[PDB]
Amino acid sequence: AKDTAAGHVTTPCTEILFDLTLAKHYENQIQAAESALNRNYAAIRSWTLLEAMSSDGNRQNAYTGLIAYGIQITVNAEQELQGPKQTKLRAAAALRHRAANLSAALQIQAAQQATLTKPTAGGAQTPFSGATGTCKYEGITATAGEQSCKYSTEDEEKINAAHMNPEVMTQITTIGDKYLTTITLDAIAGSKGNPTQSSATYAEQDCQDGGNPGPNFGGANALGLQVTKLGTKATTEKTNLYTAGGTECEHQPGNGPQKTKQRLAYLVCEANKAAIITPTDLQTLTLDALISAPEMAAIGDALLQLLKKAYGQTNEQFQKNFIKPLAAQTVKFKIVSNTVAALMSSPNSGLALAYHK
Amino acid sequence: AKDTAAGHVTTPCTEILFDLTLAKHYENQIQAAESALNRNYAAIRSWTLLEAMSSDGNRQNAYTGLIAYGIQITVNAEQELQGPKQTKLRAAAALRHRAANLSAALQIQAAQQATLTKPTAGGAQTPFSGATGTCKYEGITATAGEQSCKYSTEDEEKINAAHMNPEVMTQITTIGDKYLTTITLDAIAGSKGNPTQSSATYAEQDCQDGGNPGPNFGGANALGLQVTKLGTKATTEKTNLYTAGGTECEHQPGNGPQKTKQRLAYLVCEANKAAIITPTDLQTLTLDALISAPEMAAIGDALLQLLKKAYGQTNEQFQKNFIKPLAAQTVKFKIVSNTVAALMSSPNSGLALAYHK
Ligand SMILES: *[C@@H]1O[C@H](CO)[C@@H](O[C@@H]2O[C@H](CO)[C@@H](O[C@@H]3O[C@H](CO[C@H]4O[C@H](CO)[C@@H](O)[C@H](O[C@H]5O[C@H](CO)[C@@H](O)[C@H](O)[C@@H]5O)[C@@H]4O)[C@@H](O)[C@H](O[C@H]4O[C@H](CO)[C@@H](O)[C@H](O)[C@@H]4O[C@H]4O[C@H](CO)[C@@H](O)[C@H](O)[C@@H]4O)[C@@H]3O)[C@H](O)[C@H]2NC(C)=O)[C@H](O)[C@H]1NC(C)=O
Ligand SMILES: *[C@@H]1O[C@H](CO)[C@@H](O[C@@H]2O[C@H](CO)[C@@H](O[C@@H]3O[C@H](CO[C@H]4O[C@H](CO)[C@@H](O)[C@H](O[C@H]5O[C@H](CO)[C@@H](O)[C@H](O)[C@@H]5O)[C@@H]4O)[C@@H](O)[C@H](O[C@H]4O[C@H](CO)[C@@H](O)[C@H](O)[C@@H]4O[C@H]4O[C@H](CO)[C@@H](O)[C@H](O)[C@@H]4O)[C@@H]3O)[C@H](O)[C@H]2NC(C)=O)[C@H](O)[C@H]1NC(C)=O
């Protein structure tokens, strides 16, 4: 099914949730790739120490083969990550920027009840040069308490990274611009009798005089206004990520002015298309994965079925000789006592290598 | 001098510039540290290839000493970076979040001219149960054109990373909360004659009838209102980063509700205090820096004045034998032709190592 997450965006709060959840998704994709690289670099440091601790030439060349293989695929993956990383980060930054904007607009659009100030009565005056009575209010304000977005269980299940793989996303839904740009209000004026500049009894936040001024235009002459509500209604809009052919991003920049939704759709599309390729996890490498790896053809040719002779006929032998030592083999010396992999990621990593070399 | 940058914050636009410039500063500090690490890791890969290409045992141990030294200081610096990295990123994210908020509020607070709708005349009606005439407006709006922040040459010179070292920052300046929460407006009602529900001539966006209704309350009876301006005035506030003793961060969380300025000051303070330590740049290492390095005592003891015997009596000899080969020594083979440092950061890095090993 397509657009489960975007199709759940029907309010400012759910667009905020979508934008933040997608940004976190992109950020997490990068973090996961970088964690995989760092695990690979830690494995290379571990095999480097094991190579220095070996007495057998062919076992030393075996560790060197893993070092060479590890450096090749990990350096290459790190270089290849950089393009997609920057593309995904551009989208995450914009999505967080949008979510901030919308949250700030939400707080202002919640200010829907006005506080009237005490008015001043007058005669004719700008912008009512033809009036006999005016009632002028300065500094009417509207403020809301602190707003917060509340999400239901299903909000968080549907607007979720689990629904944000590129293969299911075709559109984004956004709140219309007027929610972020426009103040809206209702107001009403009321008059009774002959209000003039003399209508200077202000106890009811209007202009009254004559008779007995009081609540509900008690006086003989009265003029006033009230702002009875404020707040602009949110609307939603859909923006497609791809062109009609489905391959290319819609809303490419440089073709004329664009709306916020179009700039966001373009960034999200490019971030979705910039798939990250994660290399083999060296620390959990199996025998079959190693000898099947294309890079091991030239590496094995350089250092050495020849691969099975060096790394084992079974995966059990390979795990025994080349994988399990990382976590279980203890290294001890003094010039320090730790397991291989932790040691080669510790402050004594380099010193352990120099000691055994 | 202290607080050159914060002391230049006097407007929403200059606070936005400060917040974005400080966030970029923190981000750039991390990028610079990570670039230094990656340069060090590239140097270790280069020395690894040179060690495999050496025939002399003592020259091989010399490269191994640089490899061990490089791994030790760079792994340690990478681990030590993580705390400060996260602290600085927390502040940069919040500063960008604040700048977004303020920019969105700026756009709304620029909507200072109202568009009146056509009113509807009435008699007594809520909230003027005592009036004889009412004039009710629904959907008055205010919208501004797209706002942008314009900075002068000196704005950018003073609000600048060059003025954002921790030693000169004691406070932040922020726009007051009401700019982000409160709608403000002026309004005036005008009356003439005896306006009632019959005052249904709306051509002037007010309620008129009798005589000749027209501009400036031309008719005998008239009632109307205008929203003559909107917009909340920005104010500024100062928040100290440190306690009175000057060492500890003010506005630590967990002690009660906090304002936005206090949360930001705390994050900025911790980001300022979380100084990053960058290790020696291996690719530009000098002889004196190497033998002076404390880590080289145990490393040299493990592998070998003994340091000068291995690395050279002068820096010229050291640069010749251990630094300049990274950029000038060409490596060629086929199983590829490139200089040492570029090769060991290329797709053929691992294969070059395996070939010569
Ligand atoms: C979160 O909310 C905030 C707050 O609202 C949003 O921030 C706003 O973001 C917009 C969009 O980025 C900003 O508008 C941009 O402003 C740029 C600067 O304009 C000023 O300086 C330039 C000189 O550098 C002047 O030329 C401008 O004057 C002209 O424009 C004004 C306004 O229309 C007129 O009144 C003048 O008479 C001049 O005509 C300003 O003084 C500006 O460069 C930028 O322009 C591009 O985009 C607009 C449409 O937005 C096009 O009309 C324009 O032609 C430009 O587009 C061409 O170029 C781009 C590449 O740059 C191509 O990709 C296009 O396809 C096209 O070929 C734009 O106007 C705004 O300033 C900013 N507001 C604040 C307060 O910060 C955030 O966007 C929002 N974020 C998210 C993620 O939601
Ligand atoms: C950019 O602009 C946006 C838009 O304005 C800003 O976003 C706002 O940011 C604030 C601050 O982070 C958000 O407020 C926070 O809301 C949290 C969620 O509250 C709701 O859920 C909880 C349950 O999880 C309920 O308990 C709440 O109900 C209670 O509060 C409301 C409102 O007062 C009352 O009406 C109710 O009756 C309840 O009493 C809400 O329903 C909330 O957890 C969080 O609370 C801490 O901070 C407030 C002060 O802001 C304290 O009063 C409170 O006691 C909490 O503080 C203790 O805990 C913290 C650790 O969490 C300690 O550090 C403190 O020292 C203290 O011991 C806060 O209220 C707001 O929701 C959000 N708005 C939107 C629309 O997103 C951005 O901040 C801004 N960004 C920048 C960088 O400028």
From TrEMBL, chains A, B:
<keyword id="KW-0732">Signal</keyword>
<feature type="compositionally biased region" description="Polar residues">
    <location>
        <begin position="193"/>
        <end position="202"/>
    </location>
</feature>
<keyword id="KW-0336">GPI-anchor</keyword>
<keyword id="KW-0472">Membrane</keyword>
<keyword id="KW-1003">Cell membrane</keyword>
<dbReference type="GO" id="GO:0098552">
    <property type="term" value="C:side of membrane"/>
</dbReference>
<dbReference type="GO" id="GO:0005886">
    <property type="term" value="C:plasma membrane"/>
</dbReference>
<feature type="region of interest" description="Disordered">
    <location>
        <begin position="193"/>
        <end position="215"/>
    </location>
</feature>
<comment type="function">
    <text>VSG forms a coat on the surface of the parasite. The trypanosome evades the immune response of the host by expressing a series of antigenically distinct VSGs from an estimated 1000 VSG genes.</text>
</comment>
<keyword id="KW-0449">Lipoprotein</keyword>
<keyword id="KW-0325">Glycoprotein</keyword>
<feature type="disulfide bond">
    <location>
        <begin position="135"/>
        <end position="207"/>
    </location>
</feature>
<protein>
    <submittedName>
        <fullName>Variant surface glycoprotein Sur</fullName>
    </submittedName>
</protein>
<feature type="disulfide bond">
    <location>
        <begin position="13"/>
        <end position="149"/>
    </location>
</feature>
<feature type="disulfide bond">
    <location>
        <begin position="249"/>
        <end position="269"/>
    </location>
</feature>
